[PDB]
Tab-separated table of C-alpha atoms and ligand atoms in Angstrom:
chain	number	residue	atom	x	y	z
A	1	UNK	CA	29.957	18.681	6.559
A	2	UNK	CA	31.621	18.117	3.270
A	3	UNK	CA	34.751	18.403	4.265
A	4	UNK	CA	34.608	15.405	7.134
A	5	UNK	CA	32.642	13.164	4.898
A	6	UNK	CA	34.116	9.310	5.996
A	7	UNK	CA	34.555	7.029	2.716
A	8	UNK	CA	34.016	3.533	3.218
A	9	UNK	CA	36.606	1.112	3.761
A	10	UNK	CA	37.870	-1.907	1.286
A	11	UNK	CA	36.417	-5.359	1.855
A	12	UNK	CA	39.305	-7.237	2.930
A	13	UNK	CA	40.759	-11.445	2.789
A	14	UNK	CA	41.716	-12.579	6.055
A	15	UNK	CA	41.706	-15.973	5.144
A	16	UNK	CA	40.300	-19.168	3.337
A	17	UNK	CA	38.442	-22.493	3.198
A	18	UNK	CA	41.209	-25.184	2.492
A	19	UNK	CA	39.504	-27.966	-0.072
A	20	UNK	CA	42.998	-28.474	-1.449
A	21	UNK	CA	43.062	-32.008	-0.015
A	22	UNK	CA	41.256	-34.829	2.256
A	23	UNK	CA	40.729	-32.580	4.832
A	24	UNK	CA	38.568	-29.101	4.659
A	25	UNK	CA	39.693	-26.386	6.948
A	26	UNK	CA	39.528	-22.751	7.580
A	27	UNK	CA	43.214	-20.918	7.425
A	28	UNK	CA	43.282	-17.326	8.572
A	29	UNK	CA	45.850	-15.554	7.060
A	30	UNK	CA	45.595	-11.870	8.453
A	31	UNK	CA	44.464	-10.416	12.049
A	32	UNK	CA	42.177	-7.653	13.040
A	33	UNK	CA	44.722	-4.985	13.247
A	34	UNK	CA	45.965	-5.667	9.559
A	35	UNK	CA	42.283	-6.204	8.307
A	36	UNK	CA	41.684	-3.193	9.785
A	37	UNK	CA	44.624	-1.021	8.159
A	38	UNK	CA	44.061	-3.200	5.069
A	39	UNK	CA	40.193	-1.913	4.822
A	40	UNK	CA	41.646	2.011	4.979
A	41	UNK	CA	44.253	1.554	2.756
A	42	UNK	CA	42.901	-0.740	0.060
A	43	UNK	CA	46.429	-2.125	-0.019
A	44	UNK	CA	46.348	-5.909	0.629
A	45	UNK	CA	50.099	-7.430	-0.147
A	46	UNK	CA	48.883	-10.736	1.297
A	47	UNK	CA	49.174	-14.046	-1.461
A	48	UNK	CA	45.916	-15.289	-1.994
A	49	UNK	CA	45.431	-19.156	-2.507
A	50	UNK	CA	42.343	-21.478	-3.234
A	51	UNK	CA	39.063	-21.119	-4.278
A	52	UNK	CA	36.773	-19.950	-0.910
A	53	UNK	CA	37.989	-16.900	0.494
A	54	UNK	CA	36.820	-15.337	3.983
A	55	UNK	CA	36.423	-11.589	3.768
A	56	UNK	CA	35.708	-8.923	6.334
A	57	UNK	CA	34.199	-5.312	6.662
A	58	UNK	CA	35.039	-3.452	9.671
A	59	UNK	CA	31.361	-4.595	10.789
A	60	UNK	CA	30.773	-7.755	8.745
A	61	UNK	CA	32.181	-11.307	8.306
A	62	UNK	CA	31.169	-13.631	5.181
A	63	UNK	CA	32.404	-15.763	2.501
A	64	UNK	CA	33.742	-14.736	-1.353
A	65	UNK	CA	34.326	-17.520	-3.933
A	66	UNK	CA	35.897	-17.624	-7.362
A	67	UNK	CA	34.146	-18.670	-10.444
A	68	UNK	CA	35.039	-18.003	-13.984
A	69	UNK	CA	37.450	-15.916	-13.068
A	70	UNK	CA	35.319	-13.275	-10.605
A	71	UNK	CA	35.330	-13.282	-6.826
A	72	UNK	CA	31.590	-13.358	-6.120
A	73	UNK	CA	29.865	-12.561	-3.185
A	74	UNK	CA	26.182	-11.292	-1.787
A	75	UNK	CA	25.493	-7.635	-2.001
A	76	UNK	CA	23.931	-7.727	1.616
A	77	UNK	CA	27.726	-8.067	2.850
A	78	UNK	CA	29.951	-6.249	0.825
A	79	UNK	CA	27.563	-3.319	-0.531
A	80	UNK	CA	28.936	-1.807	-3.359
A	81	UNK	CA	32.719	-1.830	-1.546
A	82	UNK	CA	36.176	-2.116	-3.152
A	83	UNK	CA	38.093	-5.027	-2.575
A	84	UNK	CA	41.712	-3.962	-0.982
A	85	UNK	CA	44.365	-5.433	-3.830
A	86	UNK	CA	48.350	-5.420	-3.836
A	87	UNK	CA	47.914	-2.139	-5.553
A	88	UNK	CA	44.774	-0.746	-3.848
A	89	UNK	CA	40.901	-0.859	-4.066
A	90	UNK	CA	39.352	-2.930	-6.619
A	91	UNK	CA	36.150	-1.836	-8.229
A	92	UNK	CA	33.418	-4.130	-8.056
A	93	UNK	CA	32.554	-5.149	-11.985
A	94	UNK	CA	29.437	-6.744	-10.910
A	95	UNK	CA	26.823	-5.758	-9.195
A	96	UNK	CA	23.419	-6.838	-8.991
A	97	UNK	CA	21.136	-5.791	-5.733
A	98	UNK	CA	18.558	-7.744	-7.179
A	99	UNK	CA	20.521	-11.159	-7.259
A	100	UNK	CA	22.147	-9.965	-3.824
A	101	UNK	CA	25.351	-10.380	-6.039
A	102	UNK	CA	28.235	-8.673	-6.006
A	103	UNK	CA	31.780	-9.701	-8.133
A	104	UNK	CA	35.479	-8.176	-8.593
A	105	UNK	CA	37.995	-9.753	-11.074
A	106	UNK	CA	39.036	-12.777	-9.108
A	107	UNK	CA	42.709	-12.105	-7.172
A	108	UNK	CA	46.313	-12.773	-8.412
A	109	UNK	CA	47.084	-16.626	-7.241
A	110	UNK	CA	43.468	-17.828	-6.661
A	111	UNK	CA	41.490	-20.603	-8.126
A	112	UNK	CA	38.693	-20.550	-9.939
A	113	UNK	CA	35.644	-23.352	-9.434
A	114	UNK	CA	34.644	-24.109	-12.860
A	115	UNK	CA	30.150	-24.087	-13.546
A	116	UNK	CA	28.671	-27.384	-13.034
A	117	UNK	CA	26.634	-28.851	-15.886
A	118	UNK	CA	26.026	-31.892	-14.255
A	119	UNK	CA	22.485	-31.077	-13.724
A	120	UNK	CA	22.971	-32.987	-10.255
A	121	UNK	CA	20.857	-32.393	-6.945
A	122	UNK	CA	23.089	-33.833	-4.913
A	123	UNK	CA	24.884	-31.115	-3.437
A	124	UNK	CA	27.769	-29.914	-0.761
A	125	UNK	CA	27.319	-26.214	1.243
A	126	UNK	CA	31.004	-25.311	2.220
A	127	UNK	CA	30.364	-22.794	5.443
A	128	UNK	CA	33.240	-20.471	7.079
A	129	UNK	CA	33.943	-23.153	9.577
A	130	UNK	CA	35.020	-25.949	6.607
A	131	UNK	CA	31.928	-27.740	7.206
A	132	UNK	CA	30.791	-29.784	4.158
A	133	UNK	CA	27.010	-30.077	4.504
A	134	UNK	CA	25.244	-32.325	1.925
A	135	UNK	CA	22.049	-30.414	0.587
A	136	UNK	CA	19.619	-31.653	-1.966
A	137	UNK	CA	18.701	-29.455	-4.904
A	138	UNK	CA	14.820	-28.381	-4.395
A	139	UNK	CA	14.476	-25.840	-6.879
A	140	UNK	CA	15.886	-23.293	-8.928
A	141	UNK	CA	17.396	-21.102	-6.041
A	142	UNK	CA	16.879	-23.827	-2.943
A	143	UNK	CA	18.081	-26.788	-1.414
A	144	UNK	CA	17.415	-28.657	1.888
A	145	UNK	CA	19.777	-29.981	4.297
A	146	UNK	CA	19.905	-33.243	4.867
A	147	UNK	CA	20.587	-32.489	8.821
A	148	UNK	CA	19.105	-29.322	9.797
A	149	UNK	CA	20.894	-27.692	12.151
A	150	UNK	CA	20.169	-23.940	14.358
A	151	UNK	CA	21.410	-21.155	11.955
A	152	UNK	CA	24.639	-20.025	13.837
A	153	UNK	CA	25.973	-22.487	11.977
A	154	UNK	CA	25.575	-21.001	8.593
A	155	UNK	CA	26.076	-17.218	10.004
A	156	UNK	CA	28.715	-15.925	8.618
A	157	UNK	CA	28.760	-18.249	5.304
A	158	UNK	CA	27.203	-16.343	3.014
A	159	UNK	CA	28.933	-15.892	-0.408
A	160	UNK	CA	30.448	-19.856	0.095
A	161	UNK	CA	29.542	-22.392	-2.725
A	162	UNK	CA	27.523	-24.858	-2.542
A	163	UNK	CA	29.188	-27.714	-4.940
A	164	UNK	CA	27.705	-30.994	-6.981
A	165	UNK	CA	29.248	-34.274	-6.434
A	166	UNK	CA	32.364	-33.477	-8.868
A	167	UNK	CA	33.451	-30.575	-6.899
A	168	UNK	CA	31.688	-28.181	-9.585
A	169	UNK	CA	30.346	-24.480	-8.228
A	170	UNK	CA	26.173	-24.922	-8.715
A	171	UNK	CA	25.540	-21.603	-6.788
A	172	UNK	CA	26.200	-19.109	-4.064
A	173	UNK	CA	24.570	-19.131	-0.663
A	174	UNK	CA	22.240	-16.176	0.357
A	175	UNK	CA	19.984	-17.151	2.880
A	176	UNK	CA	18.819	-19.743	5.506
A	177	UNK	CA	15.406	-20.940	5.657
A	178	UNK	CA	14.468	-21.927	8.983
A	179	UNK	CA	11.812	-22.739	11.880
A	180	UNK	CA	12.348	-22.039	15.189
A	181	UNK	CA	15.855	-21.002	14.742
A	182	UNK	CA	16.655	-24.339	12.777
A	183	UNK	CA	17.863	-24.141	8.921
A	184	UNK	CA	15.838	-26.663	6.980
A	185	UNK	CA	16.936	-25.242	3.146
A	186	UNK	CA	19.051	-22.399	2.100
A	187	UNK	CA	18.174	-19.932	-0.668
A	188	UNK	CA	21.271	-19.299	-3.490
A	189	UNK	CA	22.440	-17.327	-6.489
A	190	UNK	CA	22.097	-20.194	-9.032
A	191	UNK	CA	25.744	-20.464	-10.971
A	192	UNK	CA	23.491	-19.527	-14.205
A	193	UNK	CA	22.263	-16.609	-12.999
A	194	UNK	CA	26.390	-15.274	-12.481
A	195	UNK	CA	26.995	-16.743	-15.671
A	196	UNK	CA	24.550	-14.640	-17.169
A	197	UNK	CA	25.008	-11.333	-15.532
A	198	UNK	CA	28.860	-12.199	-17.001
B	201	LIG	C1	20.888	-4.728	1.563
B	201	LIG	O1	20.772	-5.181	0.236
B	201	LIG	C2	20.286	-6.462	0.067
B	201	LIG	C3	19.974	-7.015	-1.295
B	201	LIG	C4	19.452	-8.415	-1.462
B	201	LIG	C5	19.243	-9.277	-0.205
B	201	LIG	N1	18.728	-10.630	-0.374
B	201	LIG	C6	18.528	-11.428	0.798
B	201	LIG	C7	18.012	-12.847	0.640
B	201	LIG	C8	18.892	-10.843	2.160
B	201	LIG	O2	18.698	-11.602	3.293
B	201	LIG	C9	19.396	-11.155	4.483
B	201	LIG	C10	20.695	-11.430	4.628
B	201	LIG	C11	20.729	-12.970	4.666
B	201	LIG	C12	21.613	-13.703	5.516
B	201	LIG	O3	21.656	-13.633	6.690
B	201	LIG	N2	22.494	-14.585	4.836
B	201	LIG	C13	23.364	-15.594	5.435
B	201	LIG	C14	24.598	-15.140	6.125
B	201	LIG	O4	25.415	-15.859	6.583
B	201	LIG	N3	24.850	-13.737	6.067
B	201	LIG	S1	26.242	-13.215	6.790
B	201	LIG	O5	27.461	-13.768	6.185
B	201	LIG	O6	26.178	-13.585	8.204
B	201	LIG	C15	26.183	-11.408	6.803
B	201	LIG	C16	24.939	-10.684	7.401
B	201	LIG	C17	26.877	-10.787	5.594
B	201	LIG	C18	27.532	-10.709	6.983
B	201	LIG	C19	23.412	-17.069	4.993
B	201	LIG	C20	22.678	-16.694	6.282
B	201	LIG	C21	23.011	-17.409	7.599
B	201	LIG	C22	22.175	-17.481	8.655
B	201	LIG	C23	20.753	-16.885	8.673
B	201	LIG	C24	20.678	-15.815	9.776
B	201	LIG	C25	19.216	-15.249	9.969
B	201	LIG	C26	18.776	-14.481	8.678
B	201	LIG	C27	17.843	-15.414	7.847
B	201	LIG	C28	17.544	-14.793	6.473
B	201	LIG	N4	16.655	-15.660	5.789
B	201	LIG	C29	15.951	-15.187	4.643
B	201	LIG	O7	15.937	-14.028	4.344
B	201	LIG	O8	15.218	-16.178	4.000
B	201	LIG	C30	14.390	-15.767	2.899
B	201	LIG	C31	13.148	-15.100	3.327
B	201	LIG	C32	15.124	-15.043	1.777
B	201	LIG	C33	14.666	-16.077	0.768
B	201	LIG	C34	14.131	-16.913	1.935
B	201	LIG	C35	18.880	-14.631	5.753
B	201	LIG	O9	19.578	-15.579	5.513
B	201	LIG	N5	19.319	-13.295	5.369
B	201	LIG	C36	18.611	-12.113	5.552
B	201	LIG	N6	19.359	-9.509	2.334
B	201	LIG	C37	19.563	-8.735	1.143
B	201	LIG	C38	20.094	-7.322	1.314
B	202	LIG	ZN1	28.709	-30.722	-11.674
């Protein structure tokens, strides 16, 4: 009936990816209860720090990073959902099904990774877990790991960056490629492709 119709709740920061020095590590800065309350409400007081955030649904956990500016993530985990902010749901201002991109203005007291134009292949997958995986460029939109590994390692990492040698955002990570349950390459939004749906 119209009058029960549910809305959808906020996608909501519960924590990060630390790259801020020697060590990478994941930081989680709000529990289930307040991610919860946070997705209803929209109303997320929390500071936000870095550049790799972890997000949550009430049925979904990935990764959101900030480039130029934008919090991007894939459209397969956040739909077209706010983002909760310290003064309520955010409208997405990108969103491209296509792509499997979504992006909201990037929050209050994050970083930003700045586009690589390095033109390198040498690259670095950051996953939820603060693993740095070294990948090498095989395309456009791939790359293969250098140590393949079963795909619960990546679940849950979508939206993360994968990075060139200077630390520079090359793309987004979409999707694992894999054989017999074992990732081989990934598939991601190329930092070009963002730049031009900017
Ligand atoms: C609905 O609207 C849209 C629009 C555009 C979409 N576009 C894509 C490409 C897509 O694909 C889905 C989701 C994605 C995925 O699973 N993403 C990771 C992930 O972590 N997600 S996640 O964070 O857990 C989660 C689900 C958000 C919470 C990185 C994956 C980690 C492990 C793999 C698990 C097994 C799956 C292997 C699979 N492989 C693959 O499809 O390979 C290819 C055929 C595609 C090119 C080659 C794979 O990766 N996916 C399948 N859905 C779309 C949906
Ligand atoms: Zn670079």
């Amino acid at each position: 009936h119209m009058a029960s119709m549910k809305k959808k709740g906020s996608v909501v920061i519960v924590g990060r990816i630390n790259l801020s020095g020697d060590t990478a590590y994941a930081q989680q800065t709000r529990g289930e209860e307040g991610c919860q309350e946070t997705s209803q409400t929209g109303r997320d007081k929390n500071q936000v720090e870095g550049e790799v955030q972890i997000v949550s649904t009430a049925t979904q956990t990935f990764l959101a990073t900030s480039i130029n500016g934008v919090l991007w993530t894939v459209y397969h985990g956040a739909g077209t959902r706010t983002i909760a902010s310290p003064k309520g749901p955010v409208t997405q201002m990108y969103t491209n099904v296509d792509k499997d991109l979504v992006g909201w203005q990037a929050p209050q007291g994050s970083r930003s990774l700045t586009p690589c134009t390095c033109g390198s292949s040498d690259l670095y997958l950051v996953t939820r877990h603060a693993d740095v995986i070294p990948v090498r460029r095989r395309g456009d939109s791939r790359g293969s790991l250098l140590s393949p590994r079963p795909i619960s390692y990546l679940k849950g990492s979508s939206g993360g960056p994968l990075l060139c040698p200077a630390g520079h955002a090359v793309g987004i990570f979409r999707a694992a490629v894999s054989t017999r349950g074992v990732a081989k390459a990934v598939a991601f939004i190329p930092v070009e492709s963002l730049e031009t749906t900017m």
